[PDB]
Amino acid sequence: TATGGELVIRTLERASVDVAFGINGIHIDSIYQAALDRSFRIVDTRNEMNAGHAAEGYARAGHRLGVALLTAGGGFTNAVTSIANAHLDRTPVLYIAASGPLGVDETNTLQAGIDQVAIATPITKWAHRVTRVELLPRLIAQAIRIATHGPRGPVLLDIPWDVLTATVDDALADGVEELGAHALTAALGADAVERILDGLAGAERPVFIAGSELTRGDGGAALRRLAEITGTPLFSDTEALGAIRESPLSFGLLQGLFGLDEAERPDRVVLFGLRFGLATAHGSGILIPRDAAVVQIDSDARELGRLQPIELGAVGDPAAAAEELARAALTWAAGWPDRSRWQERLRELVDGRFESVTAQAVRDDRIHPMDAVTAIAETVPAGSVVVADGALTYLWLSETISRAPVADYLCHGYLSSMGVGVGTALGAQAADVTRPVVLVTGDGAVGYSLGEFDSMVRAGLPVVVVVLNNRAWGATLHAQELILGPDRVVNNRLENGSYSGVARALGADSIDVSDIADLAPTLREALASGRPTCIEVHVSLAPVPPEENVIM
Amino acid sequence: TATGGELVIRTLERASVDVAFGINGIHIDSIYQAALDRSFRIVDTRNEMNAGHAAEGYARAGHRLGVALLTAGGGFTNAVTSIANAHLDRTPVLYIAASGPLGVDETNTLQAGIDQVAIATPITKWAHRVTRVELLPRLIAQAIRIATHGPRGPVLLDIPWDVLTATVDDALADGVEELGAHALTAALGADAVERILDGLAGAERPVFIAGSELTRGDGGAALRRLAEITGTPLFSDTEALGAIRESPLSFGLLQGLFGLDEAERPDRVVLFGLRFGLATAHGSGILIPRDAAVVQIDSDARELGRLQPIELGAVGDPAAAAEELARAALTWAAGWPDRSRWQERLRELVDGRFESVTAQAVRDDRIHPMDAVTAIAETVPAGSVVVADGALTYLWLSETISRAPVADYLCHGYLSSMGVGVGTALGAQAADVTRPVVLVTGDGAVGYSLGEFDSMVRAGLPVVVVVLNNRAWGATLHAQELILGPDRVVNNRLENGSYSGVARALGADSIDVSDIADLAPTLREALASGRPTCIEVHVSLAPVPPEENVIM
Ligand SMILES: Cc1ncc(C[n+]2csc(CCOP(=O)(O)OP(=O)(O)O)c2C)c(N)n1
Ligand SMILES: Cc1ncc(C[n+]2csc(CCOP(=O)(O)OP(=O)(O)O)c2C)c(N)n1
Ligand SMILES: [Mg+2]
Ligand SMILES: [Mg+2]
């Protein structure tokens, strides 16, 4: 005899998940009861929105499946921003949402009468309602297989209250559904491996660029090895920075490719799990030349050649491909040409840009954001997770993050949803409570999730939230003031409030920083203290980050 | 020459809307620019979720259309809880959401690549994308006509960025689309009027019960007149309480009908815009007898007779029906029998229950919630808007609210989404900044929206937020402890944090109350001060509200 909720927890244990995020409710309580009996950890939040974002950050920093538990009705709809974000970011998250009882379908009853499946269908890989309790293990397994294979993404399983409370025979609870233990991701074949390596061997100025899919499959070690065997410079979007950072061949974020002379532009570019899109400057060719030979490895054929021509596309798992390529490159009969001059030209370009951005900063009476994000980048411990939110804030941080020794940099995806950072950081912290998690966020974004300071305190999750306070919704203010004029700024000033005060009232440690020389020492004491912390930094609004310009 | 955004503001002015709620973004800025040129007021919030809830509260307290402005991507998905809530509550809200530019469709670009129409379709009356700028006035008008007619409900208009920035000839901007000025809602015919009045004239123990649709059409005055002409006792769900409260025939919330002897139960019940559902105890018959003659006036035929048999259903606008009935009842040839004994039996039943609930309270060292909600009900000024959130909190308040002289009581609908109250109150306040708005909310619910204290301060919206702090997600804790035992409570204690401290840091006035004798005086000084205020009340967790029992 086992309840539906017991069947959920048992199947999740078999998938090696040991934490889920949610807010309790009567519709979903049989899962909470089962979890208590099996010592399965559920971390509560102050908004289901951040239970979802926590599931994402846990998945992104933990390189694993995240799980969010949502009660019926508003517990589901509050998570929809997180589902959409996981959808565009290709993040493997299983959302388990309870529903109204089928036995009282269409009775205008509590938290019921909304088609949660239909709401989530456009932003999930699969969304499905379980209508009988005996299906639960089989259907959960199917959901887990879909979310954790490429392109990874979110799955919603909607479970009616009276399916969760129904019971099944122990033999039905027993037995194993395929979760992924026996599953092998697609590789590259030997002919493809030989052709890709041969193109790489013929290039004058090649470059590798990694994206989220390589990170999700733990292909960092194999891609770094392949770059090191072949001497190929390694770049990445923000989601794969942690995967390339350790390599002496890492040059950081691919935005640093901007600005080479026309005769020095890369002639060959091999993409591992990176789509054409916002991070590549679309198909404009200013990072990845349109006339380069582009080789694209991705899990979805719709992405191949999407915005610019490719010489070769391969549909398959970028991590598995990096491993096959690394093995064949080690025994490559001709060996690999010396690429040290090309590597050095790239080092100059990327170091030159950092030195210029820092030197060109015009400082006023407040902390310059470049100073603040340099201080933070140069202070975090090796192995830290850095999470970024706000807009001017993350554009500034993007100029220095490539130098930080991060295990993972968790920044905005295409959804670019101001406000996701606090719940993202909280979940990343839960993937390893001993690993530092530093959230760099703006004063606008942080106001979405102030209540989660209480969640961090009660769960023992010692995130350090650094607020860059420019008293404004900053990038949107900039758009009006720079395009249309100072008289055209409207609905963007935020000249009120103390975020450190808010964090203090919620039990977190808190400090204001007005002088740049206090910032790094305060961040160090925050990391040493083992406690959730808010550091409010009073930064200047006027400076325009370089990535804002190249978009202008 | 007019932009799309100008076309939006002009059409909204013609619909007599003068406030909208949103967070600025570059995709939606042409509306913000137009609004600045025309002195159209946009109130900014700290979460689009509360821009939506503010649009709802503005609509519910203002008896008008609410408007929420959402930027592309996450600005849209953060509002989905508000759309769902407006859908189940039948609240007329127009959500205008910007989208990615059509000219860069499918380029993996900023805040784009999500089908916002498809997400909202299951929770709106209409959801549609405007693909050419010249359609905007005509399509906005159509959306406004749908949202403001019965059953009222939310509408989503999705506008691509490059449609909002495109321009149209002034003559196209000029010209009038049908907004509702020339529209007449359906009445009852004379034969229906005569039959309904005749059934009412033959009953021994009749009762009227009003719901949201009567309130939305401003049928309160006509329904009160009809009850007064005929001597019919008037009850209502929480959304129509403000509409019946002024009448000497008002007996308050229909939950007060529980408990009559079998020989005294109502034999005839006329519903005005009230569905069978959570508020009627479904079709259980414990408020509306299954063997009563039920007459149901509602705007949607799916609601007629949904859970219990009806003697007569009429599909039409409950407010317009109340007016036709009132006029015919005034000239009713036979006159109306004396119903004073039945009225008095109802007074005893409703007053008796209040006296019993108050007397049976077992007080410990903390404030009893019944004491707190009685103190608040007996203190608010005549004409106040009271908003309710949290769960134990609103169940307790439901025992005393029928006595308060409220203009409107804005409580949970079927979605029962803990957390909606702060943004709801903020929008209700904006419908008339001189009218008191008191939010009674639990410590759990209030943590969704702490950042909106800053929104109230910057907009000049002096909501008084009263937090009943029992250190817990309270009703869910109760469910575990009362059904399963104290050892089965899990993920529900909230023993951390000072909500008054949070409100103070965000610029609001704030006070803690631990002794019941400080509560009413503190509430009075809060209302007299004209400033946003948080009053944190330390209440006991143990007491079980009566409406929790009748559900148990
Ligand atoms: C959910 C959501 N709402 C609105 C926007 C529009 N937007 C883009 S940048 C920005 C300003 C954010 O300000 P802040 O968090 O303080 O960061 P800053 O630019 O000031 O560093 C806004 C509102 C968005 N991208 N996402
Ligand atoms: C959005 C949402 N999440 C979760 C729930 C489940 N739920 C019902 S009552 C309750 C407790 C709310 O506690 P609080 O706001 O402090 O009010 P109290 O009962 O303590 O007065 C919860 C979490 C819900 N109804 N809606
Ligand atoms: Mg800012
Ligand atoms: Mg509570």
Residues 6+ apart with CB under 8 A from A110: A72, A73, A100, B278, B414, B416
Residues 6+ apart with CB under 8 A from A373: A393, A396, A397, A399, A400, A401, A440, A468
Q: Are strands B464-469 and B437-442 parallel, antiparallel or unpaired?
A: parallel
Give, in order, the Cα–Cα distances in Å from B521 to each of B376, B383, B396: 10, 19, 20
Residues 6+ apart with CB under 8 A from A396: A369, A370, A372, A373, A468, A543, A545
Q: A541 CA to middle of ligand 3, Å?
A: 8
The shortest C-alpha distance from A338 to chain B (Å) reads: 36
For chain A, the maximum distance between any two Cα atoms, rounded to a whole number of angstroms, is 74
Do B112 and A414 make contact, defined as CB atoms within 8 angstroms? yes
Q: Which long-range contacts link B190-197 to residues 24+ away (Cβ below 8 Å)?
A: B190/B328, B192/B314, B193/B324, B193/B325, B193/B328, B194/B328, B195/B312, B196/B270, B196/B295, B196/B312, B196/B314, B196/B325, B197/B230, B197/B325, B197/B328, B197/B329, B197/B332
Do A118 and B121 make contact, defined as CB atoms within 8 angstroms? yes
Q: Are strands B66-70 and B406-410 parallel, antiparallel or unpaired?
A: unpaired
Distance CA A469, CA B455 (A): 16
User: Phi and psi (nearest 5°) for A47?
Assistant: -160, 130
The correct CATH number of A190-346 out of 3.40.50.2020, 3.50.50.60, 3.40.50.1220, 3.40.630.10 is 3.40.50.1220
With CA atoms as reference, the chain B residue closest to A551 would be B110
Do A414 and B108 make contact, defined as CB atoms within 8 angstroms? yes
Task: Look up residue B305 and give its DSSP letter.
Answer: T
Residues 6+ apart with CB under 8 A from B380: B386, B404, B405, B406, B436, B438, B523, B527
Q: Which of A85, A476, A481, A538 should be mutated for ligand 1, with most atoms under 8 A from CB?
A: A476
Q: Which of A23, A24, A26, A114 should be mutated for ligand 2, with most atoms under 8 A from CB?
A: A23
Q: Are strands B464-469 and B66-70 parallel, antiparallel or unpaired?
A: unpaired
Distance CA B104, CA A445 (A): 27
B2-173 CATH fold: Rossmann fold (3.40.50)
Q: Are strands A2-3 and A167-168 parallel, antiparallel or unpaired?
A: antiparallel
Provide the experimental method for this PDB entry.
X-ray
Do B276 and A107 make contact, defined as CB atoms within 8 angstroms? yes
Q: Suggest the residue from A3, A21, A29 to mutate for an interface test with chain B (most B CBs closer than 10 A).
A: A29
- Which structure tokens are listed for B28? 């939606």
Q: Where would I find the beta strands (DSSP E) of A4-92?
A: 19-22, 41-44, 66-70
Do B497 and A49 make contact, defined as CB atoms within 8 angstroms? no
B373, B386 Cβ separation under 8 angstroms: no
Q: How many beta-carbon pairs below 8 A join chains A and B?
A: 267
A436, A384 Cβ separation under 8 angstroms: yes
Please state which CATH class domain B190-345 belongs to: alpha beta
Distance CA B256, CA B267 (A): 16
B98, B161 Cβ separation under 8 angstroms: yes
Asked if the C-beta of B275 comes within 8 angstroms of chain A's C-beta atoms, the answer is: yes
Q: B52 CA to middle of ligand 2, Å?
A: 20
Task: Tell the burial category of B434 from Cβ atoms under 10 Å away from its Cβ (0-12, 13-18, 19+).
Answer: exposed
Distance CA B33, CA A484 (A): 10
Residues from chain A that touch B38, judged by Cβ atoms under 8 A, are none
The shortest C-alpha distance from B77 to chain A (Å) reads: 5
Q: B312 CA to middle of ligand 2, Å?
A: 38
Q: Please, where in chain B does CATH 3.40.50.970 lie?
A: 2-173, 361-551
Give, in order, the Cα–Cα distances in Å from B128 to each of A437, B119, B120, B187: 41, 11, 9, 30
- Which structure tokens are listed for B118? 């498809």
Number of other residues whose CB lies within 10 A of the CB of residue A463: 30
Give the residue carrying structure tokens 């109230």.
B456
Q: Residue A113, by phi and psi: left (phi above 0), alpha (psi -120 to 50) or beta?
A: left
- Which structure tokens are listed for A92? 């493997």
Q: Suggest the residue from A43, A95, A119, A471 to mutate for an interface test with chain B (most B CBs closer than 10 A).
A: A119
Asked if the C-beta of A346 comes within 8 angstroms of chain B's C-beta atoms, the answer is: no
The shortest C-alpha distance from A374 to chain B (Å) reads: 26
Q: Suggest the residue from A415, A424, A493, A550 to mutate for an interface test with chain B (most B CBs closer than 10 A).
A: A415
The A residues from 119 to 158 touching B (CB cutoff 8 Å) are 119, 121-123
Give the residue carrying structure tokens 């009263």.
B466
- Ligand 1, CB cutoff 6 Å, lining residues: A 390-393, 416-419, 442-445, 468, 470, 472-476; B 23-25, 48, 71, 74-75, 78, 111
Instruction: From B245, B184, B251, select the one nearest B217 (Cα to Cα).
Output: B184
The shortest C-alpha distance from A536 to chain B (Å) reads: 13
Residues 6+ apart with CB under 8 A from B285: B291, B308
Q: Suggest the residue from A47, A491, A504, A548 to mutate for an interface test with chain B (most B CBs closer than 10 A).
A: A491
Q: Are strands A312-315 and A384-388 parallel, antiparallel or unpaired?
A: unpaired
The B residues from 498 to 517 touching A (CB cutoff 8 Å) are 498-502, 504-507
Q: Does ligand 2 come within 6 angstroms of the Cβ of B470?
A: yes
Instruction: From A237, A253, A255, select the one nearest A318 (Cα to Cα).
Output: A237
- Which structure tokens are listed for B133? 């700028």
Asked if the C-beta of A26 comes within 8 angstroms of chain B's C-beta atoms, the answer is: yes
Do B419 and A22 make contact, defined as CB atoms within 8 angstroms? no
Do A32 and B473 make contact, defined as CB atoms within 8 angstroms? no
Distance CA A45, CA A448 (A): 13
The shortest C-alpha distance from A228 to chain B (Å) reads: 31
Distance CA B197, CA B188 (A): 12
User: Residue type at B328?
Assistant: A
Give, in order, the Cα–Cα distances in Å from B53 to each of B39, B95, B354, B387, B420: 23, 11, 31, 12, 6
Give, in order, the Cα–Cα distances in Å from A529 to each of A501, A510, B57, B89: 18, 12, 43, 48
Distance CA B320, CA B326 (A): 10
Instruction: From A11, A106, A23, select the one nearest A72 (Cα to Cα).
Output: A23
Do A501 and B499 make contact, defined as CB atoms within 8 angstroms? no
Q: Residue B281, by phi and psi: left (phi above 0), alpha (psi -120 to 50) or beta?
A: left
Tell me, in Å, the resolution of the deposited structure: 2.0
- Please state the length of chain A: 552
Distance CA B419, CA A448 (A): 13
The shortest C-alpha distance from B113 to chain A (Å) reads: 8
Number of helices and strands in chain B (H, E): 24, 20
With CA atoms as reference, the chain B residue closest to A48 would be B448
User: Residue type at B251?
Assistant: F
Asked if the C-beta of B178 comes within 8 angstroms of chain A's C-beta atoms, the answer is: no
Q: Please, where in chain A does CATH 3.40.50.1220 lie?
A: 190-346
**Exposure letters B341-369 (e unless 16+ CB within 10 A, then b):** ebbeebeebbeebbeebeeeeeeeebbbb
Asked if the C-beta of B306 comes within 8 angstroms of chain A's C-beta atoms, the answer is: yes
CATH number, span B361-551: 3.40.50.970
Q: A536 CA to middle of ligand 3, Å?
A: 12
